[PDB]
Subunit: 332 residues, 4 copies
Amino acid sequence: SVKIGHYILGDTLGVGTFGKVKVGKHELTGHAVAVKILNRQKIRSLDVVGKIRREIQNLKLFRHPHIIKLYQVISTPSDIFMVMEYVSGGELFDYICKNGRLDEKESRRLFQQILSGVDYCHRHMVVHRDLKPENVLLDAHMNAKIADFGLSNMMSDGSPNYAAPEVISGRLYAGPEVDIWSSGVILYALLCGTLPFDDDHVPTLFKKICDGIFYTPQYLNPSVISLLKHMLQVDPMKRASIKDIREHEWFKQDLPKYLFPEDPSYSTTMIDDEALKEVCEKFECSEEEVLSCLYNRNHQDPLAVAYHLIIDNRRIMNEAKDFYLATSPPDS
Amino acid sequence: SVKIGHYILGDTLGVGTFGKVKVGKHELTGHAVAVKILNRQKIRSLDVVGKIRREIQNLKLFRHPHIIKLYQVISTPSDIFMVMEYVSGGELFDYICKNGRLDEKESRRLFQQILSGVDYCHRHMVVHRDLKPENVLLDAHMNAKIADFGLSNMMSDSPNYAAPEVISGRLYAGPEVDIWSSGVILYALLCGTLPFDDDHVPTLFKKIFYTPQYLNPSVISLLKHMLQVDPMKRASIKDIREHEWFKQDLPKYLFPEDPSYSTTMIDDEALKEVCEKFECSEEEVLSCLYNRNHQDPLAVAYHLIIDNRRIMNEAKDFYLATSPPDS
Amino acid sequence: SVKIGHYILGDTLGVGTFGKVKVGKHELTGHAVAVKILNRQKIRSLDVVGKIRREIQNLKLFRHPHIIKLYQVISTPSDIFMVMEYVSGGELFDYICKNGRLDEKESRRLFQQILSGVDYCHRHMVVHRDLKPENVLLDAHMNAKIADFGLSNMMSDSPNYAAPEVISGRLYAGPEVDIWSSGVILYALLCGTLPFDDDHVPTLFKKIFYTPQYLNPSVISLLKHMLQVDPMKRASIKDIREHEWFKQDLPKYLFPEDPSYSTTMIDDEALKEVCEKFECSEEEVLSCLYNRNHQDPLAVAYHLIIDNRRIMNEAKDFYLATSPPDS
Amino acid sequence: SVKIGHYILGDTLGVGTFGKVKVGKHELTGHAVAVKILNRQKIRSLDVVGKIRREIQNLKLFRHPHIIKLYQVISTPSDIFMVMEYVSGGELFDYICKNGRLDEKESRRLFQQILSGVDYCHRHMVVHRDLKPENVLLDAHMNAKIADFGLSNMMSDGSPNYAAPEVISGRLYAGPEVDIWSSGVILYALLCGTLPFDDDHVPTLFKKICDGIFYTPQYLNPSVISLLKHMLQVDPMKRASIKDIREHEWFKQDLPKYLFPEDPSYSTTMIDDEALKEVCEKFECSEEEVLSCLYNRNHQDPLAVAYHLIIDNRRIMNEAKDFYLATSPPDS
């Protein structure tokens, strides 16, 4: 046999530059997996700025239903083994080329799954990596699966289509913004079976992408079209954020609870009326302006810093003045 | 006329190598703050391996109630201002040496606060930093506050304990030593002296420990678990959290709630199945799952079994809002 | 009256998402510069995973002659100013499309400059970034300058080539693709067209390459080595450095001198001894030593033999001013 | 046998929390080594903030004569092996307790070796780590060896003495500064056989450390005493730097060439007289002020930035105007 750890290796599923991907099965539980074998020698001869060494030590063991799981990593003197979730689905966009567009309900279900993984990635990844639809798969059960968990898509080998406006240009971007735009063309591809901007050659293609105007099939209700317009904003400052999509009526319909974490937000019952009023007075602003910061966790805003100074230095203690610790702290 | 952002700077409260620390007050709200002024010139001339630069950019704005708050940082061409919570109380270990030991009621309260900040630090500090009891202050309101959130005990310008592993200079993770460190603090509150150090440096090493007349057997078991010489046997944060003496009058806001405990864990099938195929006990498998030990072949097997279930949503996917661990 | 540090800002030269780029001139010396203004507010509202923040703090002040220089960075409460070298020439690939291909003499010169900057980037850039030929400009003095030193092609607001490994979306180190990328640039200088792309996207993948009438067999061998489809067979920076066509009229200042080559390497004893105990050739062992491949069991064995020598200072310890590689 | 990779394990030299250190020998070349075996299970149960995982991935393979070499790291599913240089010397400060002080020549030789390693560490280490004299060993040939290369000293198990002023206090420091101070008490220990500040109990001990005044035995020539005073400056801004020590006459005597790298510095022949004069005129300064920046690589100084702007924008090109690329770039 070919055996590493608790896993017995099998047929070769594909070959990369740095090694092959063999099918495997846990010797005890019998579950099937996909094991990527990276050869230390091949890596050493290639990775001279330490990029790959780096990408590998940035991996985490991802448990999310819609991202390919990295169950664990096993090391040997000459090799490194990555035991992953086995997914035989092929690309999602390949399914769309074959089957055509899907119905609203299957589009929404899948879209909610994909967006669930993207959000999870934003939270837990050492370094950001752009969402690529080629890396979106669908397993035997018709479930979305993100192929790239921080090392390249090992699953698939062998485009003429999408790029975000900031990306087509030489412009600097954060990447959740472009993930939204990317997630926009995916959602569109699901409902329509086409890309929102597919023009024939390169000059006219990336031209309309900057225009932002896209065709709207008749069977698209104005609710999903409003969402699609917001996600596809050419101006990243005007573009929808994950929270925007999360609060959109079209998206929220039949949304499974387990998908997104229950993030504690700011509640009206926390509000300190005296402090709110003091700030609005000492500044020029209105309550909406200050409340907006508290609800959106805009804590570095001079209004929020002031409000917090008043809360923390109250002599009498309140039940709702303590939302501080449950939260993570932000960075500068 | 010394004003930065919304803050007017005052008397110099303390002077460091890279800049001084001035007291300030907010220009609109009257609140007092403590502003650390870091000089780009002094720093540039001194940290040549980039330690200080790194440490500064690893800072986050800590808003925990028992850790000194960093409200905001303001940048100028020649300086970097750190607007922090102003706490004018002295070191806690200083208060215990002058006025005597405290009572069970006040010791527990203070200890719970301190451990709350320590846990918070373990969670969100980028690089670990040993908890030093000298960095624990006590304000006018008698609330514990940890001074070092990742630069320095910024506030202020004496036998020394260190964990066994630290004294012998061996390799350690540091939450382990933080537990040990918090052990001598807890002891100090109840006693007013340190559990081992009566001495100068040589004999302090090898130095159980003395147990004053009224110490209920409940708190002695806790202190005993925290002060274990063997780190593999030493108490963990979760152990203290579940200890009876600790659970008494424990403020709600102190710790976050994500322990995965019964119904959300219970897989009767995988529980025993792993315990069968691997020859081990339930306790061992349970232990890996509660911790970030998912890389343990027991946890990996368990998860393989869980993720391949037919229909179970409650246990299988509902737990996946927390974070992944690393290899 | 827009002045930052010693610099007076001018007409807006370009506007980005996070701030604009204004031209400036030094207040004392008349020199012109290009100042990127980054807005803390825009950034804070957009990079929520900290990518931009990270990228900014990974910046170093690059003074290489063929890479856009970052002279200094100035910080204000609301903004971050980047004082850079002002280069008003257009993209190099733009110059080649309008006015025709260049001659061997000028192509070699430009190519040597470009590779010099690329090598510099490989050495001192914290995170690797693929060399994009669109980011290569050409100044009024006809000297190549790479625009992206680690933030963005900051200067300016068209078929696209990508290395085989990049197009298929597979894992890569990136100096490999930089060689490939520099290959199509070198080809562009001599030809005035791209080596494969005649097309739109599908056929560009699988797409040796055409060889115009007078191309001496010396430059065709180089281009052939750089444009290898298999990265394991592809030319490395050191290969190009040692190539005959490249070595011609090569400016002194371009590359640093630390190749360890003959007398400083020669260990006749370890050379063969490793080659004996391991069954392999001299070429293989030599290859690991020249590179940072010291982790190869051949190099480890060789070093074990070297460090345990009796008296040899010249080869043994004299080589240890460079840097260690990592595991 | 007990064999990992090309190495055959042997007698246990000591036991750590996370594993033992066994003697080993290369199966082919026969050279003896010390192999630290770190157990993945022990690490996982302890390292929960990821400190140790981190320290290990920060390791580099150090080739320096006076720092313990990490020849390579070998990985297995349950273990990690670190193959290091075998050094049987015991602590340097232990040798001093036994033998007493050394002569100037053996002190200088050893001091030059130690300082050579410290400088190397400053250059190549991901994260700074304070120099501890307990971690300074001397091999069978009387050669200084730094035990901690970025993971704890594995070599030795089982103090009442030194700490730098910034360290005794709660003060923030860079650490090459305190390394100098640390290296100061080591040099002193070598010549004297005692520590410069050894007072009896803790109150009086750290008190004199802040005073900086120390006893000076008669057999100490004023040249080494000047060096010792500079290294032991209580004010870190006044304290000697590696370059200061490097240029000191006492240190430079009989200094082996291989010890320190030949760093290119700034030479008089590079000087641009017109540019130097322009700067001094447009500013208030003198040539010394500007030259000092160029010689000390103080390039972020407004004088240096100005000087460089003039050099880089000269129309005619010079041979000596190009010192730029041979250098590494600095950080902000």
